[PDB]
Design a protein around this ligand. Structure first.
Ligand SMILES: CNc1nc(C)c(-c2ccnc(Nc3ccc(O)cc3)n2)s1
Length: 294
């Protein structure tokens, strides 16, 4: 829209590119996402508009939707840093536990809210978790999944990431629930603590086997019905589960306990956001502020 002026490529992804942009009229800085086009499904519109109605302190607000010439522009409230950059800037020092605790608490608050409205994110990753200098963190592109279907690459064709993909999805489950977001969040939580991606797979089979080497190869004992999954293969290598003490050192036992429940193979036993909020780990939760390098 000739009402916005891009300032810098802020992100890249599936749908399209993300830009920091200054509204030429109101003067506000927003985040713009240009998506790519035969007629633009009205279904994607209905659902994109329904997403515009959810307001919570931990979800990046979708100010507006500009459908022009079969091209979609999404205007979002702007935040100053994604969690990925913030992690790289903390690579040597690490993020303090009080801040990690808070971020997790807020992130679960937004999740609890979205989920109670039957809305799920579907593709959480450090790249769409945005923080402000006031100590808050928000979910971005929340629900932008029920707008299309998972392709093969990005706008210019690149590399998405199966690193944060829950196992039910890697295994062919098409009707997954809100639980996939908790799984994603758990991976991110672990990454914040250790400063290294939990499961950096380089293919769908590497992703899966990586989860298997750490949490052990799943079977009907921990995940009933897993063998009926579309992509399950009786011939998967059988790895044993490694203790979390080795996966997320030196996070405390309350966190490890919480992370554990967020990373349970069985989607149904996977703790929900609302319950996660009552976990003992958040007993001494506060709202510390980050030290951002903008
Ligand atoms: C990569 N995909 C992204 N998507 C949205 C909606 C993003 C968004 C929304 C609002 N504010 C910001 N800020 C920001 C993003 C990346 C940065 O590296 C720095 C700041 N980003 S980023």
């Amino acid at each position: 829209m000739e009402n916005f002026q891009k300032v810098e490529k802020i992100g890249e992804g599936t749908y399209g590119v993300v830009y920091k942009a200054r509204n030429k009229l109101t003067g506000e800085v927003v985040a713009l996402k240009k998506i790519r086009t035969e007629g633009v499904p009205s279904t994607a519109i209905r659902e994109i508009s329904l997403l515009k109605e959810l307001n919570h302190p931990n979800i990046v607000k979708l100010l507006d939707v500009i459908h022009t010439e079969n091209k979609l522009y999404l205007v979002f409230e702007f935040l100053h840093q994604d969690l990925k950059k913030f992690m790289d800037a903390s690579a040597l020092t690490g993020i303090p536990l009080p801040l990690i605790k808070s971020y997790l608490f807020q992130l679960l608050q937004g999740l609890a809210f979205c989920h109670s409205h039957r809305v799920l994110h579907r593709d959480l990753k450090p790249q769409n978790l945005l923080i402000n200098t006031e100590g808050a963190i928000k979910l971005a592109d929340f629900g932008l999944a029920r707008a299309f279907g998972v392709p093969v690459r990005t706008y210019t064709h690149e590399v998405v990431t199966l690193w944060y993909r829950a196992p039910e999805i890697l295994l062919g489950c098409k009707y997954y629930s809100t639980a996939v977001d908790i799984w994603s969040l758990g991976c991110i939580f672990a990454e914040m603590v250790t400063r290294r991606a939990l499961f950096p797979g380089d293919s769908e089979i590497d992703q899966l086997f990586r989860i298997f080497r750490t949490l052990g190869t799943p079977d009907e004992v921990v995940w009933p019905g897993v063998t009926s999954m579309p992509d399950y293969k009786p011939s998967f290598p059988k790895w044993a589960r490694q203790d979390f003490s080795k996966v997320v050192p030196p996070l405390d036992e309350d966190g490890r306990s919480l992370l554990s429940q967020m990373l349970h193979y069985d989607p149904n036993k996977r703790i929900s956001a609302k319950a996660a909020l009552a976990h003992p780990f958040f007993q001494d939760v506060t709202k510390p502020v980050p030290h951002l390098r903008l």
